[PDB]
C-alpha cells in the first residue's frame, strides 16, 4: 500500500532561516532543544549531505529506541527536503518504509508555512494504524515548536 497524509502549519520565522535551522542543522539542534523526544542523532554512513543515513536515538521510555532515516534530496534554494524512514520504529511487518517531504514557504507577512507529506509504503495492503499518523504529527509538532522558541530567544542565530 502507499497512503499519503499531507499536513500544514505556520511559523513566525522566515522560511529561509527556519529552513537552515529546523532542517539543515536541525539534526543536532533537536537533542538540544527537545531532549525528551530526541536523545541523539548520528551519521551511520555519509557526511550529512544528500544520501546521508542517520540513526536517531530516543530517550529511554518512549515507544521506540531508535530509527534510521535517509536524506534523499535537498533543494537549497526552494527549501524542499525529502527523506525516508527505513529501519526501526514504525518500520516492520505492516510498514516497509515512510517517504517524507517537507517544503517551507515564505508567507507575505514574513512568517512561513511547512507542508508535509507522508507516503507510508505498507506491506501489500495492510492499513496505516491511525496510531502512527497521530504521533508523526505530534512528534514533528513539538519539534517545530521547540525550535521556534529557541530561534526566537536567540535572535542572532542561524543568520
Amino acid at each position, epitope marked *: 500500500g502507499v497512503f499519503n497524509y499531507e499536513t500544514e502549519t505556520t511559523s513566525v520565522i522566515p522560511a529561509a532561516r527556519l529552513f537552515k535551522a529546523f532542517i539543515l542543522d536541525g539534526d543536532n539542534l533537536f537533542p538540544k532543544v527537545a531532549p525528551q523526544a530526541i536523545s541523539s542523532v*548520528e*551519521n*551511520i*554512513e*555519509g*557526511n*550529512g*549531505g*544528500p*544520501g546521508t*543515513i542517520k540513526k536517531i536515538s530516543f530517550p529511554e521510555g518512549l515507544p521506540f529506541k531508535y530509527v*534510521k532515516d*535517509r536524506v*534523499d*534530496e*535537498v533543494d*537549497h534554494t526552494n527549501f524542499k527536503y525529502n527523506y*525516508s524512514v*527505513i*529501519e526501526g520504529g514504525p518500520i516492520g511487518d505492516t510498514l*516497509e*518504509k515512510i517517504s517524507n517531504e517537507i517544503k517551507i514557504v515564505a508567507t507575505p507577512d514574513g512568517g512561513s508555512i511547512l507542508k508535509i507529506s507522508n507516503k507510508y509504503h505498507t506491506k501489500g495492503d495492510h492499513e496505516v494504524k491511525a496510531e502512527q499518523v497521530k504521533a508523526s504529527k505530534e512528534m514533528g509538532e513539538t519539534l517545530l515548536r521547540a525550535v521556534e522558541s529557541y530561534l526566537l530567544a536567540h535572535s542572532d542565530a542561524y543568520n
Partner: antibody
Framework: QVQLQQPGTELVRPGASVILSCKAS????????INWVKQRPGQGLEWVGN????????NYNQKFKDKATLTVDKSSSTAYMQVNSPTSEDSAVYYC???????????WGQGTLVTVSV | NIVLTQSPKSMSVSVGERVTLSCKAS??????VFWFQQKPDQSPKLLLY???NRYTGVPDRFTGSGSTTDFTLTISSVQAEDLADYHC?????????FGGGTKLEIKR
C-alpha cells in the same frame, strides 16, 4: 572484514553489454549505499551514481544518465553497474564503494578494468 | 553540479618539507568535503574524511581545513611514501564531484 569484491578485468566488443558485479560481505548489504566511481588511465575520478539496496533507490550523474544502469540482487547481496553500447571512451576502471560513519568512500572495491576492443 | 578546483597541477618538495594542497569549489559546500590519497597502482584511499579530519590510519603529518569554498590538505613533513596523487570530493549537492587531483612529487 567488510569487503567489496569485483573482477579485475572485463573485455568487451564495442557495442556489447558490459556487466560490472560487486559483491559485498562483512556488513548488512541493505543498510548501506554503493557509490560507483569510474576512472580512466591517469585521469581524475568521476562519480557515476549511487544506489541504496533494499529499496533500490538511485541517483545518476548526468553524464551517464542513459549509458549506465545500477541495480542490485539483495539475495546474493551484490550490486551491478551495467554499461550499454561501450566504446573506447568507456574503457576504464570502475570502483564500487561504500562509506561509513561520517563519510563516503571509506571502502573501495578492487576496481575492474574494462577494455572495449575487437 | 559543483566544480572542485585543485592547484597546482603538481608539487615538488623534498622529503621532510612541508606542503599544502588547495581545493576551491564553485559554491559553498559547507563541510561536505573530503580528501583521497591515491598512490601509483592503487585504488584511492580515504585520507581526510570531512575537512581537517584524519580517517582511520592516516598519520598526524596529515591535516586540513576550510569550509564555505576554500579548503586545504597539508603535510607537515612529507615522506617518501606520501608520494601520491591527492584528490578532492564534495557531497554537498548531487552529483558528487571531484577535484582534478594534484600530484605530489619528491625531490632528492
Amino acid at each position: 572484514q567488510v569487503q567489496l569484491q569485483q573482477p579485475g578485468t572485463e573485455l568487451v566488443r564495442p557495442g556489447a553489454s558490459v556487466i560490472l558485479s560487486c559483491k559485498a560481505s562483512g556488513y548488512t548489504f541493505t543498510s548501506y549505499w554503493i557509490n560507483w566511481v569510474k576512472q580512466r588511465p591517469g585521469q581524475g575520478l568521476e562519480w557515476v551514481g549511487n544506489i541504496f539496496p533494499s529499496d533500490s533507490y538511485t541517483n545518476y550523474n548526468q553524464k551517464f544518465k542513459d549509458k549506465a544502469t545500477l541495480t542490485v540482487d539483495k539475495s546474493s547481496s551484490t550490486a551491478y553497474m551495467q554499461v550499454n553500447s561501450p566504446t573506447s571512451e568507456d574503457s576504464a576502471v570502475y570502483y564500487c564503494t561504500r562509506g561509513a560513519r561520517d563519510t563516503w568512500f571509506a571502502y573501495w572495491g578492487q576496481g575492474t578494468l574494462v577494455t572495449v576492443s575487437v | 553540479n559543483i566544480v572542485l578546483t585543485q592547484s597546482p597541477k603538481s608539487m615538488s618538495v623534498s622529503v621532510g618539507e612541508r606542503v599544502t594542497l588547495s581545493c576551491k569549489a564553485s559554491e559553498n559546500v559547507d563541510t561536505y568535503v573530503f580528501w583521497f590519497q591515491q598512490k601509483p597502482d592503487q585504488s584511492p584511499k580515504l585520507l581526510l574524511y570531512g575537512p581537517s579530519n584524519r580517517y582511520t590510519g592516516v598519520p598526524d603529518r596529515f591535516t586540513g581545513s576550510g569550509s564555505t569554498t576554500d579548503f586545504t590538505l597539508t603535510i607537515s613533513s612529507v615522506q617518501a611514501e606520501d608520494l601520491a596523487d591527492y584528490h578532492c570530493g564534495q557531497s554537498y549537492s548531487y552529483p558528487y564531484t571531484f577535484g582534478g587531483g594534484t600530484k605530489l612529487e619528491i625531490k632528492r
